[PDB]
Paper text:
The nap particle is an immunogenic surface adhesion complex from Mycoplasma genitalium. Cryo-electron tomography (cryo-ET) of [name] revealed the tetrameric organization of the nap particle complex, consisting of two P140-P110 heterodimers. The P140-P110 heterodimers form the ‘tight interface’, while the ‘loose interface’ is formed between the two heterodimers.
In contrast to previous studies, this analysis by classification of the native nap particle displayed both the ‘open’ and the ‘closed’ state of the tight interface, resolved at 17 Å and 18 Å, respectively. The resulting structure of the P110-P140 interaction site in the crown region for the ‘open’ state shows that the distance between P110 and P140 at the tight interface is sufficiently large so that the interfering loop (P140 residues 807–827) no longer interferes with the β-hairpin of P110 (residues 455–465). The binding of 6′-SL is stabilized by hydrogen bonds from both P110 and P140. Importantly, the opening and closing of the tight interface is accompanied by an interaction between P110 and P140 at the loose interface of the nap particle. In the ‘closed’ conformation, there is no density seen at the loose interface, whereas in the ‘open’ conformation, P110 and P140 come into proximity at the loose interface, thus indicating an interaction between loop 662–666 of P110 and loop 1173–1179 of P140. In the open state, nap particle is bound to sialylated oligosaccharides mediated by P110 and further stabilized by P140. In addition, there is an interaction between P110 and P140 at the loose interface.
Residue numbers in the entry:
A (entry chain C): 59 to 782, 789 to 819
B (entry chain C): 916 to 1252
C (entry chain A): 25 to 257, 261 to 412, 417 to 470, 478 to 591, 603 to 936
The structure:
Amino acid sequence: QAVDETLTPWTWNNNNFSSLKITGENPGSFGLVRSQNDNLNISSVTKNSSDDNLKYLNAVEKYLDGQQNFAIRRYDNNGRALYDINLAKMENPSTVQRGLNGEPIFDPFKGFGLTGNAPTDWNEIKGKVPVEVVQSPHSPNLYFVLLVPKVALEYHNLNNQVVKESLEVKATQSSFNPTQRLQKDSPVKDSSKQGEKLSETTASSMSSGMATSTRAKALKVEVERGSQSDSLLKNDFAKKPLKHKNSSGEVKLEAEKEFTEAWKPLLTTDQIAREKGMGATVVSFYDAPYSENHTAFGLVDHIDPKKMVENYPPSWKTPKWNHHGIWDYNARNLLLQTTGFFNPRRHPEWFDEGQAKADNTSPGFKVGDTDHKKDGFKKNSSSPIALPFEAYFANIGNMVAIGNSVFIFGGNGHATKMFTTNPLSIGVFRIKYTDNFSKSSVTGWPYAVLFGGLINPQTNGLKDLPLGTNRWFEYVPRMAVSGVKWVGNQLVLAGTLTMGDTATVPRLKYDQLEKHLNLVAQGQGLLREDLQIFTPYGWANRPDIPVGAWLQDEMGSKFGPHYFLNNPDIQDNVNNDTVEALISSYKNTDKLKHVYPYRYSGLYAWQLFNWSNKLTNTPLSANFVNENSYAPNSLFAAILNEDLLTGLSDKIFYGKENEFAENEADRFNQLLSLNPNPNTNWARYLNVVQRFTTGPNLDSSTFDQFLDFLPWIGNGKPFSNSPSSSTPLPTFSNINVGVKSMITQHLNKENTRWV
Amino acid sequence: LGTIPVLINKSGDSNDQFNKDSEQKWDKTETNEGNLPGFGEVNGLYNAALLHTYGFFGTNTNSTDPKIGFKADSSSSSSSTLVGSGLNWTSQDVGNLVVINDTSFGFQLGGWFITFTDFIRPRTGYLGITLSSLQDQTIIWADQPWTSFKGSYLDSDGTPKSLWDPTALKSLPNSSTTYDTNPTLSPSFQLYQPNKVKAYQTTNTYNKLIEPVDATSAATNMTSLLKLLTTKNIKAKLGKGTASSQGNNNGGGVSQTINTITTTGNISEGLKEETSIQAETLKKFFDSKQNNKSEIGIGDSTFTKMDGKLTGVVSTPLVNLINGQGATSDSDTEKIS
Amino acid sequence: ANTFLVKEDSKNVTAYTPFATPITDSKSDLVSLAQLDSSYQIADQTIHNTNLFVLFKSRDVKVKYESSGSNNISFDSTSQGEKPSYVVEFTNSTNIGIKWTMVKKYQLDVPNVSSDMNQVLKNLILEQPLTKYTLNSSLAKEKGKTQREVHLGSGQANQWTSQRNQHDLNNNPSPNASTGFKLTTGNAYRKLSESWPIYEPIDGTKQGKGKDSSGWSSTEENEAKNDAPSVSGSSGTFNKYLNTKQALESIGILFDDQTPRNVITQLYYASTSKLAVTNNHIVVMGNSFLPSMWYWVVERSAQENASNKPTWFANTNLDWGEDKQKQFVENQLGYKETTSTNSHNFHSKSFTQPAYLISGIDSVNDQIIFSGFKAGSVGYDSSSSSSSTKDQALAWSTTTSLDSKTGYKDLVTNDTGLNGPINGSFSIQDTFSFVVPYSTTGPIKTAYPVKKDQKSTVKINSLINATPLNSYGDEGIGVFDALGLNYNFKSNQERLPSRTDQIFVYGIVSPNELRSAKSSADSTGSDTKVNWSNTQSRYLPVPYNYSEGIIDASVTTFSGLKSIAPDGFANSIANFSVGLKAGIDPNPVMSGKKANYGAVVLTRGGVVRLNFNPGNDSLLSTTDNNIAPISFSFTPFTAAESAVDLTTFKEVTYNQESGLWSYIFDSSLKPSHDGKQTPVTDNMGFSVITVSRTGIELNQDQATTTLDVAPSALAVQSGIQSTTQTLTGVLPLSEEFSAVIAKDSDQNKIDIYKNNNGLFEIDTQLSNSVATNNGGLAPSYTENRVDAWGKVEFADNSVLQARNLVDKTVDEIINTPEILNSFFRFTPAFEDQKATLVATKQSDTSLSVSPRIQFLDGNFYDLNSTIAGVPLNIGFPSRVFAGFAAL
Ligand SMILES: CC(=O)N[C@H]1[C@H]([C@H](O)[C@H](O)CO)O[C@@](OC[C@H]2O[C@@H](O[C@H]3[C@H](O)[C@@H](O)CO[C@@H]3CO)[C@H](O)[C@@H](O)[C@H]2O)(C(=O)O)C[C@@H]1O
Ligand SMILES: [K+]
């Protein structure tokens, strides 16, 4: 009960909490404290080869219960300690007694009435450590605290052969070489299947056009359902005249032949939900500084992973698949990349089997059979997105309270991060109270649906950032979270955020991988880098040409009229007489589409402007999404609807409006948007953000001027280089680089003099 | 965070060196003597300028020339790789959100404190951001640097503040123990691959895109660069890797953001246009202010030392307590009972 | 009036209490009371200074147009179709209950027609009305002649540069710009004396007869009929033609059996749809469904048995924002010339924009606000004989060029397309655009596509479209014009407006302005004109995300554009607007400034805010012409508001306490049958959209006298909706609560919806509490229950002795309301519901107390409360306390 001076205050790395300021009727502080003692040899808890992690983690918690003490003492308004609150050790623990209207029975000098019995699950809460504390905005003397297993603090002090990196260091006995891990060999035309390519348009409709040319025509693509029980009648997007290399066996993503001791979670999402001692907990409690009965508990809630994972969007059951489907799946697998939008080859932190499922196989859809008409149907999934131990504690921390409810926005991830492993906050939990605080409820939702209302009007920074989405939640935003607080009247969020993947929107020609090793390694999970890299000489004409169309100039002797290398100077001129042969005739239908005999080309900005998940002026608009970031690559802060965050229902209901197409005939005429069904409610959650910000309130090259103005912390020198013949040049801005000249000779040779 | 990578052909090792002088021509960007890569470079920026700002060649960052860099040659086929900046910070190194008044708020992000002062009420001619940088070389050149940050808080004199302790750092998961650890798994390490590239044209060098070649055996020609992938080997060649860094041996204590007024971040003479392009008039407006950044809201955080360990803070609406010490008799209230 | 009026049907208005109960005997057949026959129905109604103003129109109405004589428009007296529409003023004669009695009755007569007017009307032709079931491809019309075919001819664009000076087309880079669209195929066009068909073509590019009246009825009408036969419970194939007869009846088209009545009749019947009332005037305007060509300003002073005359819109000059914007519209109305003969159109006879699709109409202070869409009007060559543009409409994109100096003023005053075609397709370098890249020997000249040779002998007559598009031509610029998809390539990408297609129009009209209009309408002999100088226009396209699969980066045109339109329309190209409503901000303004007011109106994909300056009753402007007229703001709908079927709009209320607009949609308004004659089965239920204001409003503090950012609005689908119940009425009791009255089967039921942080949800316990009235006007009181009146427990009498209040007298206690709040403990049924005790002296030694309790509407009720003067007799208790002293 009374104060013990042997426990000293500390800051947790994952949320940076250490104290709460109490406000209103009796001010003061609560703060975290721990025992001062050194020589914490956790490696003495020996791990055998013949058993799983759970009995080891329970032995580490039992060891830490002996080796350390933790508590949450109260202080007065000047910082004098009042009472100790070591939750593992305090005398006569009880819940608070209630009147028939749910109110706690109280009188300030006596304190609260105690029932004389502890809350539910007391036999497994007593081992947990408290890590964040908050106060009710509307109810007097009422507080909330968040608790975790002590391994969520000690994770980096556990022994290194179980708390591994996602990549091995190796013994380097043959000397080191970074090319030995990379799957690298490029695909080739099939020696026994050359003829299944797209057909050339034998006659093309006039459409009241007039001009003509000698060049080869556009290529037809057709899809239709037929009458057969398990096959289409046509499916030209599912053609496969390319195949992988043989180099002492076939080159492919095949985890069991690469990962000899595959990296895996400390616990799976279905373990943490059922092993009630390993899940995080929130409790309500009551406190008064000068009473006889100064402190007692309210109610206990589990921050259950299933209350987050069962609220993932329907597509997160099949993270190896996306709404473009068969052609995009094949083009990614041919380039040895991650298929879908979230697979574990890049993102193992959210999967219960970690690296052991780092493959493109069995994506929840029928693919790779002997006939293009037989591929392209929905089936059972091989691996859904989960919430395993490492991602779970990155989704814990950063609390706030609003009305009769309290929240958890997740941490920065420094609970569970490793040098090749990037767990993050992927959303928000809420805990809600009912029957005048007699009862409670718990839920959570991902940022992917909560950010769905973002549009270009909602920021004073730059426009068109890779933050857009559509009717399928295949864009997956996640954050290292700085916190949530009241800025005067406004509720505000801050941190760092994942964009969509900007490094792989431009795409390679199929054969050239052996001269582009970094650009494939950056897609392979071997290089975990999100920065954009200059590589234009090896890109194809468009990111979205289907794999059946590519093999139209294997010699390069026609400069590939339908598909060739991205050089900007040798683009086909549409002029105005040219269009009738190359586009101004090839009309599409409800079963027929075309690939044009036109040499498209352009540099990195034109690639992103066409195929990035850019923001726009209206929500759910972004039909193109590439892939999701390794790590946070944006600043982020936002203003929230605190009312709507209080008003939204506990359970999100999705429906068939968020499902991928069941077969490819529904993919050919695929609906871009739909109204919510009568039973569903997902569209209500889109609007929790009012406004957001990302950097300086500057436009165009002016922003590159700010990038040049700030000092580099390693030497105190600005990247602009101007504060001291043969002087050096700046890096970000173009001012004083090279020479001035007039743009009057460029492109159209017009408007430049005045506009 | 200071962790943009740079592209390299050449290390500080014997006969592998690249020079600040007689090997780079800033006045002649039309030819290979300007050393622009044309392949494998980070988008939007320029590599040789970034190498100069890092000081990988010349006496800019160290008491003698480290001789690390990139060169374009017309005599032979050549090899390169990306390498790190020498810094180990990362974008997950974000600390406490703190609110200063009814409209202004900020947070710690690695070696910086950042403030979003105008987000609730924007204005014309204001850039909307302020930034304060840490100075301590013992923190900035550490191997796991964010572990030295002890928390950030609002203080009752009207400023945000933070705590640091140079005694809090620890070694990597192993000390190499018995073998030459070239791939030291660490927060700025990556498995960067060889890029192999054809000879540059001696004149009219950039009239066409630069052409890469089969890199699948290229690693044998570039073993010095493969050793330079680990940040500790970059720091060693920059003279930062050991006690040659100097400064305070201990020196934990308190850090504070720069002073501010209603004029701070007003750049209205660098904003808008009437003669030229807006970045160029902002560049003119910045050039006379390179030695006076604090009125732009850009600068270094002030710092004071403390005795003993820093473990954390606890906070009240009147006072902040360090390790739980700093309380007072409340002398203005003694006579009331 | 402490009541809500509910239109139970086409004839009956019943008054409801805040307890969602009818006031007894209040239910009144306003048709019968207006001494109108059983063919009349209520179109619109409004309260002004506590009297009820009703607009009635007749299903029996028959109008005629005879091109000769000159009382050209008249009612058809023969049979029984002399059935003009009436406005009627009713007053409540009783102070207990509701006895509506008739005060003033005004007939809405047919327009006078001048000579100049009747020459345009002779050959005026009108497009068949757009419906629910009209497709992008139904609208689409066959592409007309190129500018260089019209002029030079069959022949070459190798001579385009030698020749364009000899036809006033100097420096014109657009030999292939379209001069418009063919009237031999598509949507039926018809004169005032003809009838539209019940059949709409699926591909109007192929399947219509357009203005080919004679061709329709001898060939293509039998095809349409055999392909698309009316139901008869038949069923057919609908390969070439939808059959929209029931969708037609739905939007107010009238019928002798299976044939619609003449155009002039449907014009009149639509024209008398909406009303508004000021101290001096009744104004009457048309619906959002047909174009209207006239409106009424009735002088409320008008003698008892008079014939109030409508003012033509062709005689009503608006300010479109800048003179150029007027010229754009007037240039494309038709060919003007002193040189031509019998070639008469609105432009050639010096009329202005002749027709609007009106959103609706309201009054604030003594001001009429209106808004709507410019109904497309263009010239068409009705020539007979080798006329190249024969049977062709003369229309062109007027969309601002790429090089246009940016900033609004510049954009809308750009000389691009001003006098003729300029827009088509352009492949500069390798960057496709439909819009001219620039607008050098000298400056670019545009000309009207009637070749100099035929200038004397040509016949260009006026038509009106069914929609806000001028140009139906099946080229790619038409889609981009209609969808808002033309953009510049500068360092901002500001969107390039049209000034002829998709043009929204609003204003505020002063009582002097309504006075000219009445003057135009009474004008002896010639056409008198009216200037309305408090108006603006705005390019307001339908949203591009209400379509799919548009090509960029076989260009997509109207005949191939794919609709995904969620808002109850097949088509995704023609904008629509409905339920304009004004309202006074309740939010205080700085003293010595007058109360703020706005209006809002729904359009496809968003709510529009109109903003006013109460100071001089003007549109809000700001000094800069760079920022765009600050009188208008557009806030786009989310998925939830986009999903509401806008063709089901029933009514819009504004509440001055909440400062909130309620838009009621009733799905019982859907037609019985599809265009394929399939029974329509989602005709059950209703929906409410709540509009609020957003931004910094005028005159908060010294800073907000000046504004350079337009205030806007926000439409939220509130949560009050149903796909099961039949609506009677929605009573917006308060910001926190709405009462819905509905039938599940056939009896009325009361649901209460409670606002939870911006989202309304049913409260089943409060619904049951409110609905338990036991046949009374208000919810029961039960002592032992937290009901609609909360719960009141009285102190025991023994409290007086314990607290020494026996030493206080009755008069002391009775004048000490804080003492007598200590005589009960109150449990609210909803948060912040309040209650007090009213005290009454009973003897020297004793008093009684009786609770005064707030209901859902924020109002206090007690034993003596009335609605409409009728005691509610709710049943609050009384409680004696006794033992107080006499001093
Ligand atoms: C909307 C429109 O008509 N655009 C036309 C453009 C436009 O004027 C420019 O792009 C603006 O910079 O002009 C085009 O034509 C110019 C050339 O025409 C050639 O003649 C062709 C003709 O173009 C074709 O329609 C039919 O065959 C003719 C040959 O018999 C001339 O030989 C050449 O010198 C140019 O004048 C263009 O952009 O090419 C046509 C566009 O439709
Ligand atoms: K009661």
